[PDB]
Amino acid sequence: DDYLQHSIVPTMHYQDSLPRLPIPKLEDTMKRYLNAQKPLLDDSQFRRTEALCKNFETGVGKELHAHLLAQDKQNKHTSYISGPWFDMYLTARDSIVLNFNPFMAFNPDPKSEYNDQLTRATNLTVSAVRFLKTLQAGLLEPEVFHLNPSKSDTDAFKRLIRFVPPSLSWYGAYLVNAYPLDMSQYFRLFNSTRIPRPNRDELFTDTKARHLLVLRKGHFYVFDVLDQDGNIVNPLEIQAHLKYILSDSSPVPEFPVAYLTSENRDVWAELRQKLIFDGNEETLKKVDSAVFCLCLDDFPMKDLIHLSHTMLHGDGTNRWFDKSFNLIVAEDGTAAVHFEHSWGDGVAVLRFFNEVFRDSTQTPAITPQSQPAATNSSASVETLSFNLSGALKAGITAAKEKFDTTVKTLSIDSIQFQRGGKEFLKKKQLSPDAVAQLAFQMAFLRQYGQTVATYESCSTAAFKHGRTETIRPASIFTKRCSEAFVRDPSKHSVGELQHMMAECSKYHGQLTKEAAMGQGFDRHLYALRYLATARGLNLPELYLDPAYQQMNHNILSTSTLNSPAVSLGGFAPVVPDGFGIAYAVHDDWIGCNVSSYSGRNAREFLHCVQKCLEDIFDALEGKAIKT
Ligand SMILES: O=C([C@H]1CCCCN1C(=O)COc1ccccc1)N1CCc2ccccc2C1
């Protein structure tokens, strides 16, 4: 059939009974805020911040918190953070390229010949539409984090829990140490896009649409991937239509419209209004409502750096950046997903990514020897055309200028550290995640001499409409440990260094568990600030403190995930003087993909990260420190 999964348990089965996202006590939030400030501030700075926190906790902060609790009690169907968080990204006026949109790249098909461009674009597209159908039919297995898979992730459990009424089902999972996740964002994977509007953008979805959008050399094509009965179009016909598009010989347009999706949102909002005034509403609606955007690039990947640049931003002509996601397939079959950040936290993208990789490689729709259907693709594929005024052509030229200058300032580098990974670190009783984070702190101290604001994302999707919470990896323990390794490397014994790493690991574990349970401080303080500003209050003094600004100017911005489908991921720094650090600790090795703008150097930072990991592993093995 048209489904890539046949879940015994309905996809949304746990959604009605997910626990409510907790709001921390204000006293706990202020202590945690101060703990994270300790390694960042000097003594006088810290004293001033401590005084502000005291005043906040007994003054306006106590009143904002009371209002927050009352609001949350009235809005028990949702979380306190979800709305304010969407609002933050949709109101932001900055370009979504680099600033917000990340990418994940697929591993190749292990069967070499299946990485032909036409073959792979066909197989990935068909698997993606099979995912759409599976999700819509409620046949996708619910998202569930298992602590004890042998007891919870079985057919016996599934056949039972399906009969448990939706209002009790979460408790059933809880009893076997399994934690169902929120899935309310998943629908925006398909038929969805971000529409630029003055002041605040909007998210648009049309679940009726049946066509795919394809971009090639800056030209837009659409054709049906679902038929009038809602069944997936014959994969050999999809192959024919993609062959037709690949055979187009038209050169890149003089004014490629895709450039506009990279603009400042107020600029793009106005230009889109001009496009509609000039009669392009029907064409825009076809772009907005397509199942997703498939991008066929007409060059192969030279190496991992070229790959990262291509998938993170490309050349500006061949991505519709507003779309929920862009599925990109290069001439050598290299494939990735570039996605718009505002519509969700990315867990849906990872689930999509994983199922599509599995389905397209284990049960591919077509083979490299498959002959395309005998169809008349000129009748079934529409080539879109935009009526462009003189004002629009000038806008596209201006958009291209801004895009080209910015993109040129970005550098990217990667490393594959093959000395060891999770297996070794676990034998040493350390958290592998804590060890990676320690290495970044150590590298920054060694190369730049500072301890700086550091961000690590953590999911709060165990809760109803849960989102993310910030783990703050820069602690008094990592600062102490980094200084031990770096300032005078021969100073401490290996036993002392092992003890210090064990402290970092223990504390990082505590912060991780707290964050996953909604007990970080960042979202709580953000929600109080949002409540103040929404009610037109003067910003409380806590938020005017340079320390607060510094804590939210994340020089080290990091993210990780674990998946056999993902070759690497990437994202640009979130501040001009920052790094964007994507990493993964595998069983036997560690990978990092780091971006920087002109003010820093990603490759040089990874020289240092490599040195720091060698140091850490040496000490763990009981070897004397060496250069
Ligand atoms: O594995 C984790 C944590 C801790 C290790 C770093 C990555 N984690 C993340 O949450 C990553 O979260 C994001 C979210 C959005 C974008 C990037 C990364 N948990 C944390 C809690 C939790 C909750 C539900 C299901 C599994 C886990 C395991």
Coordinates of all heavy atoms in Angstrom, one line a residue, residues 501-572:
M501 N 36.8 15.8 35.7 CA 35.9 15.5 34.6 C 34.6 14.8 35.2 O 33.5 15.0 34.6 CB 36.6 14.6 33.6 CG 37.7 15.4 32.9 SD 38.4 14.3 31.6 CE 39.6 13.4 32.5
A502 N 34.8 13.9 36.2 CA 33.7 13.3 36.8 C 32.7 14.3 37.5 O 31.5 14.1 37.4 CB 34.2 12.3 37.9
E503 N 33.3 15.4 38.0 CA 32.4 16.5 38.5 C 31.6 17.2 37.4 O 30.4 17.5 37.6 CB 33.2 17.5 39.3 CG 33.8 17.0 40.6 CD 34.6 18.1 41.4 OE1 35.4 18.9 40.7 OE2 34.3 18.3 42.6
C504 N 32.3 17.5 36.3 CA 31.6 18.1 35.2 C 30.5 17.2 34.7 O 29.4 17.7 34.4 CB 32.6 18.4 34.0 SG 33.9 19.5 34.3
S505 N 30.8 16.0 34.6 CA 29.8 15.0 34.0 C 28.6 14.9 34.9 O 27.5 14.8 34.4 CB 30.5 13.6 33.9 OG 29.6 12.6 33.4
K506 N 28.8 14.8 36.2 CA 27.8 14.7 37.2 C 26.8 15.9 37.2 O 25.6 15.8 37.2 CB 28.3 14.4 38.6 CG 28.5 13.0 38.9 CD 29.1 12.7 40.3 CE 29.7 11.3 40.4 NZ 30.6 11.2 41.6
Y507 N 27.4 17.1 37.1 CA 26.6 18.3 37.1 C 25.9 18.5 35.8 O 24.7 18.9 35.8 CB 27.5 19.5 37.4 CG 26.7 20.8 37.6 CD1 25.9 20.9 38.7 CD2 26.8 21.9 36.7 CE1 25.2 22.1 38.9 CE2 26.1 23.1 36.9 CZ 25.3 23.2 38.0 OH 24.6 24.3 38.2
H508 N 26.6 18.2 34.7 CA 25.9 18.3 33.4 C 24.7 17.3 33.3 O 23.7 17.6 32.7 CB 26.9 17.9 32.3 CG 26.4 18.2 30.9 ND1 26.4 19.5 30.3 CD2 25.9 17.4 30.0 CE1 25.9 19.4 29.1 NE2 25.5 18.2 28.9
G509 N 24.9 16.1 33.9 CA 23.8 15.2 34.0 C 22.6 15.7 34.7 O 21.4 15.6 34.3
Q510 N 22.9 16.4 35.9 CA 21.9 17.0 36.7 C 21.1 18.1 35.9 O 19.9 18.2 35.9 CB 22.5 17.6 38.0 CG 21.4 18.2 38.9 CD 22.0 19.1 39.9 OE1 23.1 18.7 40.5 NE2 21.4 20.2 40.3
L511 N 21.9 19.0 35.2 CA 21.3 20.0 34.4 C 20.5 19.5 33.2 O 19.4 20.1 32.9 CB 22.4 21.0 33.8 CG 23.2 21.9 34.8 CD1 24.1 22.8 34.0 CD2 22.2 22.7 35.6
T512 N 20.9 18.4 32.6 CA 20.2 17.8 31.5 C 18.8 17.2 32.0 O 17.8 17.5 31.4 CB 21.0 16.6 30.9 OG1 22.2 17.2 30.3 CG2 20.3 15.9 29.8
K513 N 18.9 16.5 33.1 CA 17.6 15.9 33.7 C 16.7 17.0 34.1 O 15.5 16.9 33.8 CB 17.9 15.0 34.9 CG 16.7 14.3 35.4 CD 17.0 13.4 36.5 CE 15.7 12.6 36.9 NZ 15.8 11.9 38.2
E514 N 17.2 18.1 34.7 CA 16.4 19.2 35.1 C 15.7 19.9 33.9 O 14.5 20.2 33.9 CB 17.2 20.2 35.9 CG 17.4 19.7 37.3 CD 18.3 20.6 38.2 OE1 18.9 21.6 37.6 OE2 18.4 20.4 39.4
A515 N 16.5 20.1 32.8 CA 16.0 20.8 31.6 C 14.9 20.0 31.0 O 13.9 20.6 30.6 CB 17.2 21.0 30.6
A516 N 15.1 18.7 30.9 CA 14.1 17.8 30.3 C 12.8 17.8 31.0 O 11.7 17.5 30.4 CB 14.6 16.4 30.2
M517 N 12.8 18.2 32.3 CA 11.7 18.2 33.2 C 11.1 19.6 33.3 O 10.3 19.8 34.2 CB 12.1 17.7 34.6 CG 12.4 16.2 34.6 SD 10.9 15.2 34.2 CE 9.9 15.6 35.6
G518 N 11.6 20.5 32.5 CA 11.1 21.9 32.6 C 11.7 22.8 33.7 O 11.2 23.8 34.0
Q519 N 12.8 22.3 34.3 CA 13.4 23.0 35.4 C 14.7 23.7 35.1 O 15.6 23.9 36.0 CB 13.6 22.0 36.6 CG 12.3 21.4 37.1 CD 11.5 22.4 37.9 OE1 12.0 23.3 38.6 NE2 10.1 22.2 37.9
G520 N 14.9 24.1 33.8 CA 15.9 25.1 33.5 C 15.4 26.5 34.0 O 14.3 26.6 34.6
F521 N 16.1 27.5 33.7 CA 15.7 28.9 34.1 C 15.4 29.8 32.9 O 14.7 30.8 33.0 CB 16.7 29.6 34.9 CG 18.0 29.9 34.2 CD1 18.2 31.0 33.5 CD2 19.1 29.0 34.3 CE1 19.4 31.3 32.8 CE2 20.3 29.2 33.7 CZ 20.4 30.4 32.9
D522 N 15.9 29.4 31.7 CA 15.8 30.3 30.6 C 14.4 30.6 30.1 O 14.0 31.7 29.9 CB 16.7 29.8 29.4 CG 18.2 30.1 29.6 OD1 18.6 31.2 29.4 OD2 18.9 29.2 30.1
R523 N 13.6 29.5 29.9 CA 12.3 29.7 29.4 C 11.4 30.4 30.4 O 10.5 31.2 30.0 CB 11.6 28.4 29.0 CG 12.3 27.6 27.9 CD 12.4 28.4 26.6 NE 13.1 27.7 25.6 CZ 14.4 27.7 25.5 NH1 15.1 28.5 26.2 NH2 15.0 26.9 24.5
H524 N 11.5 30.1 31.7 CA 10.8 30.8 32.7 C 11.0 32.3 32.7 O 10.1 33.1 32.7 CB 11.1 30.1 34.1 CG 10.2 30.7 35.2 ND1 10.5 30.4 36.5 CD2 9.1 31.4 35.2 CE1 9.6 31.0 37.3 NE2 8.7 31.6 36.5
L525 N 12.3 32.7 32.7 CA 12.6 34.1 32.7 C 12.2 34.8 31.4 O 11.8 35.9 31.4 CB 14.1 34.3 32.9 CG 14.6 34.1 34.3 CD1 16.1 34.5 34.4 CD2 13.8 34.9 35.3
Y526 N 12.2 34.0 30.3 CA 11.7 34.6 29.0 C 10.2 34.8 29.1 O 9.7 35.9 28.6 CB 12.1 33.7 27.8 CG 11.4 34.2 26.6 CD1 11.8 35.3 25.9 CD2 10.3 33.5 26.1 CE1 11.1 35.7 24.7 CE2 9.6 33.9 24.9 CZ 10.0 35.0 24.3 OH 9.3 35.4 23.2
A527 N 9.5 33.9 29.6 CA 8.0 34.0 29.7 C 7.6 35.2 30.6 O 6.6 35.9 30.3 CB 7.4 32.7 30.3
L528 N 8.4 35.4 31.7 CA 8.1 36.6 32.5 C 8.4 37.9 31.8 O 7.6 38.9 31.9 CB 8.9 36.6 33.8 CG 8.7 35.4 34.7 CD1 9.6 35.4 35.9 CD2 7.2 35.3 35.1
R529 N 9.4 37.9 31.0 CA 9.8 39.1 30.2 C 8.7 39.4 29.2 O 8.2 40.5 28.9 CB 11.1 38.9 29.5 CG 11.7 40.1 28.9 CD 12.9 39.7 28.0 NE 13.7 40.8 27.5 CZ 13.3 41.6 26.5 NH1 12.1 41.4 25.9 NH2 14.1 42.6 26.2
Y530 N 8.2 38.3 28.6 CA 7.2 38.4 27.5 C 5.9 38.9 28.1 O 5.2 39.7 27.5 CB 7.0 37.0 26.9 CG 5.9 36.9 25.8 CD1 6.3 37.1 24.5 CD2 4.6 36.8 26.1 CE1 5.4 37.0 23.4 CE2 3.6 36.7 25.0 CZ 4.1 36.9 23.7 OH 3.2 36.8 22.7
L531 N 5.5 38.4 29.3 CA 4.3 38.9 29.9 C 4.4 40.3 30.3 O 3.4 41.1 30.1 CB 4.1 38.0 31.2 CG 2.8 38.2 31.9 CD1 1.6 38.0 31.0 CD2 2.7 37.2 33.0
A532 N 5.6 40.8 30.7 CA 5.8 42.2 31.0 C 5.6 43.1 29.7 O 4.8 44.0 29.7 CB 7.1 42.5 31.6
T533 N 6.3 42.7 28.6 CA 6.2 43.4 27.4 C 4.8 43.4 26.7 O 4.4 44.4 26.2 CB 7.3 43.1 26.4 OG1 7.3 41.7 26.1 CG2 8.7 43.3 27.0
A534 N 4.1 42.2 26.8 CA 2.8 42.1 26.3 C 1.8 43.0 27.0 O 0.8 43.4 26.4 CB 2.3 40.7 26.3
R535 N 2.0 43.4 28.2 CA 1.2 44.2 28.9 C 1.7 45.6 29.0 O 1.3 46.4 29.9 CB 0.9 43.6 30.3 CG 0.3 42.2 30.2 CD -0.2 41.7 31.5 NE 0.8 41.6 32.5 CZ 0.6 41.5 33.8 NH1 -0.7 41.5 34.2 NH2 1.6 41.5 34.7
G536 N 2.7 46.0 28.2 CA 3.2 47.3 28.0 C 3.8 47.9 29.3 O 3.8 49.1 29.5
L537 N 4.5 47.0 30.1 CA 5.2 47.4 31.2 C 6.7 47.7 30.9 O 7.2 47.2 29.9 CB 5.2 46.3 32.3 CG 3.9 45.8 32.7 CD1 4.0 44.7 33.8 CD2 3.0 46.9 33.2
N538 N 7.3 48.7 31.6 CA 8.7 48.9 31.4 C 9.4 47.6 31.8 O 9.1 46.9 32.7 CB 9.2 50.0 32.4 CG 8.7 51.4 31.9 OD1 8.8 51.7 30.7 ND2 8.1 52.1 32.8
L539 N 10.5 47.3 31.0 CA 11.3 46.1 31.2 C 11.9 46.2 32.6 O 12.5 47.2 33.0 CB 12.4 46.2 30.2 CG 13.1 44.9 29.7 CD1 12.0 43.9 29.2 CD2 14.1 45.1 28.7
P540 N 11.6 45.1 33.4 CA 12.2 45.1 34.7 C 13.8 45.2 34.7 O 14.4 44.8 33.7 CB 11.8 43.7 35.3 CG 10.5 43.4 34.6 CD 10.7 44.0 33.2
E541 N 14.4 45.7 35.7 CA 15.8 46.0 35.8 C 16.7 44.8 35.6 O 17.8 44.8 35.0 CB 16.2 46.7 37.1 CG 15.6 48.1 37.2 CD 16.4 49.1 36.4 OE1 17.7 49.1 36.5 OE2 15.8 49.9 35.7
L542 N 16.2 43.6 36.0 CA 16.9 42.3 35.8 C 17.3 42.1 34.3 O 18.4 41.6 34.0 CB 15.9 41.2 36.2 CG 16.6 39.8 36.1 CD1 17.4 39.6 37.3 CD2 15.5 38.7 36.0
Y543 N 16.4 42.5 33.4 CA 16.6 42.3 32.0 C 17.4 43.4 31.3 O 17.8 43.2 30.2 CB 15.2 42.2 31.3 CG 14.4 41.0 31.8 CD1 13.3 41.3 32.6 CD2 14.7 39.7 31.5 CE1 12.5 40.3 33.1 CE2 13.9 38.7 32.0 CZ 12.8 39.0 32.8 OH 12.0 37.9 33.3
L544 N 17.6 44.5 32.0 CA 18.4 45.6 31.5 C 19.8 45.4 31.9 O 20.7 46.1 31.4 CB 17.8 47.0 32.1 CG 16.4 47.3 31.6 CD1 15.8 48.4 32.4 CD2 16.4 47.6 30.1
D545 N 20.1 44.6 32.9 CA 21.4 44.2 33.3 C 22.2 43.6 32.1 O 21.8 42.7 31.4 CB 21.2 43.1 34.4 CG 22.6 42.6 35.0 OD1 23.6 43.2 34.7 OD2 22.5 41.7 35.8
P546 N 23.4 44.2 31.9 CA 24.3 43.7 30.9 C 24.6 42.2 31.0 O 24.8 41.5 30.0 CB 25.6 44.5 31.2 CG 25.2 45.7 31.8 CD 23.9 45.4 32.6
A547 N 24.5 41.7 32.3 CA 24.7 40.2 32.5 C 23.6 39.4 31.8 O 23.9 38.3 31.3 CB 24.8 39.9 34.0
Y548 N 22.4 39.9 31.9 CA 21.3 39.2 31.2 C 21.5 39.2 29.7 O 21.3 38.1 29.1 CB 19.9 39.8 31.5 CG 18.8 39.0 31.0 CD1 18.3 37.9 31.6 CD2 18.2 39.3 29.7 CE1 17.2 37.1 31.1 CE2 17.1 38.6 29.2 CZ 16.7 37.5 29.9 OH 15.6 36.7 29.4
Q549 N 21.9 40.3 29.1 CA 22.2 40.4 27.7 C 23.3 39.4 27.3 O 23.3 38.8 26.3 CB 22.5 41.8 27.2 CG 21.3 42.7 26.9 CD 21.0 43.6 28.0 OE1 21.4 44.8 28.0 NE2 20.1 43.2 28.9
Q550 N 24.4 39.4 28.1 CA 25.5 38.6 27.9 C 25.1 37.1 27.9 O 25.6 36.3 27.1 CB 26.6 38.9 28.9 CG 27.9 38.0 28.7 CD 29.0 38.4 29.7 OE1 28.9 38.1 30.9 NE2 30.0 39.0 29.1
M551 N 24.3 36.7 28.9 CA 23.9 35.3 29.0 C 23.1 34.9 27.8 O 23.0 33.7 27.5 CB 23.0 35.2 30.3 CG 22.3 33.8 30.5 SD 23.5 32.4 30.8 CE 24.1 32.9 32.5
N552 N 22.5 35.8 27.1 CA 21.6 35.5 25.9 C 22.3 35.9 24.6 O 21.6 35.9 23.5 CB 20.3 36.2 26.1 CG 19.4 35.5 27.2 OD1 19.3 36.0 28.3 ND2 18.9 34.3 26.8
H553 N 23.6 36.1 24.6 CA 24.4 36.4 23.5 C 25.3 35.1 23.4 O 26.4 35.1 23.8 CB 25.2 37.6 23.7 CG 26.0 38.1 22.4 ND1 25.5 39.0 21.5 CD2 27.2 37.8 22.0 CE1 26.3 39.2 20.6 NE2 27.4 38.5 20.8
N554 N 24.8 34.1 22.7 CA 25.4 32.7 22.8 C 26.5 32.5 21.8 O 26.3 32.0 20.7 CB 24.3 31.7 22.7 CG 23.3 31.7 23.8 OD1 23.7 31.5 25.0 ND2 22.1 32.1 23.6
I555 N 27.7 32.8 22.3 CA 28.9 32.6 21.5 C 29.1 31.2 21.1 O 29.5 30.9 19.9 CB 30.1 33.2 22.2 CG1 30.0 34.8 22.2 CG2 31.4 32.8 21.5 CD1 30.9 35.4 23.2
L556 N 28.9 30.3 22.0 CA 29.0 28.8 21.7 C 27.6 28.3 21.7 O 26.9 28.2 22.7 CB 29.8 28.1 22.8 CG 31.3 28.4 22.8 CD1 32.0 27.7 24.0 CD2 31.8 27.9 21.5
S557 N 27.1 28.1 20.5 CA 25.7 27.6 20.3 C 25.8 26.1 19.8 O 26.4 25.9 18.7 CB 24.9 28.5 19.3 OG 23.5 28.1 19.4
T558 N 25.3 25.2 20.5 CA 25.5 23.8 20.2 C 24.3 23.0 20.1 O 23.3 23.3 20.7 CB 26.4 23.1 21.2 OG1 25.6 22.8 22.4 CG2 27.7 24.0 21.6
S559 N 24.3 21.9 19.3 CA 23.2 21.0 19.2 C 23.6 19.7 18.7 O 24.6 19.5 18.0 CB 22.2 21.6 18.1 OG 20.9 20.9 18.2
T560 N 23.0 18.6 19.2 CA 23.3 17.3 18.8 C 22.1 16.4 18.6 O 21.0 16.7 19.1 CB 24.2 16.6 19.9 OG1 24.6 15.3 19.4 CG2 23.4 16.4 21.2
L561 N 22.3 15.3 17.9 CA 21.3 14.2 17.8 C 22.0 12.9 17.4 O 23.1 12.9 16.9 CB 20.2 14.6 16.7 CG 20.7 15.0 15.3 CD1 21.0 13.8 14.5 CD2 19.7 15.9 14.6
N562 N 21.3 11.8 17.6 CA 21.8 10.5 17.3 C 20.9 9.8 16.3 O 19.8 9.5 16.7 CB 22.0 9.7 18.6 CG 22.6 10.5 19.7 OD1 21.9 10.8 20.7 ND2 23.9 10.8 19.6
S563 N 21.4 9.5 15.1 CA 20.6 8.8 14.1 C 21.5 8.1 13.1 O 22.4 8.8 12.5 CB 19.6 9.7 13.5 OG 19.2 9.2 12.2
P564 N 21.2 6.8 12.8 CA 21.9 6.1 11.7 C 21.6 6.7 10.3 O 22.3 6.4 9.3 CB 21.4 4.7 11.8 CG 20.0 4.9 12.5 CD 20.2 6.0 13.4
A565 N 20.6 7.6 10.2 CA 20.2 8.1 8.9 C 21.0 9.4 8.6 O 21.1 9.8 7.4 CB 18.7 8.5 8.9
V566 N 21.6 10.0 9.6 CA 22.2 11.3 9.4 C 23.7 11.3 9.3 O 24.4 10.7 10.2 CB 21.9 12.3 10.6 CG1 22.6 13.6 10.5 CG2 20.3 12.5 10.8
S567 N 24.2 11.8 8.2 CA 25.6 11.8 8.0 C 26.2 13.0 8.7 O 27.2 12.9 9.4 CB 26.0 11.9 6.5 OG 25.4 13.1 5.9
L568 N 25.6 14.2 8.6 CA 26.0 15.3 9.4 C 24.9 16.4 9.3 O 24.0 16.4 8.5 CB 27.3 16.0 9.0 CG 27.4 16.7 7.6 CD1 28.8 17.4 7.5 CD2 27.2 15.7 6.5
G569 N 24.9 17.3 10.3 CA 24.0 18.4 10.3 C 24.7 19.7 10.4 O 26.0 19.7 10.5
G570 N 24.0 20.8 10.4 CA 24.7 22.1 10.5 C 23.8 23.3 10.7 O 22.7 23.3 10.3
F571 N 24.4 24.4 11.2 CA 23.7 25.6 11.4 C 24.7 26.7 11.6 O 25.8 26.5 12.0 CB 22.6 25.6 12.5 CG 23.2 25.2 13.9 CD1 23.5 26.2 14.8 CD2 23.4 23.9 14.2 CE1 24.1 25.9 16.0 CE2 23.9 23.6 15.5 CZ 24.3 24.6 16.4
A572 N 24.3 27.9 11.2 CA 25.2 29.1 11.3 C 25.2 29.6 12.7 O 24.3 29.2 13.5 CB 24.7 30.2 10.3

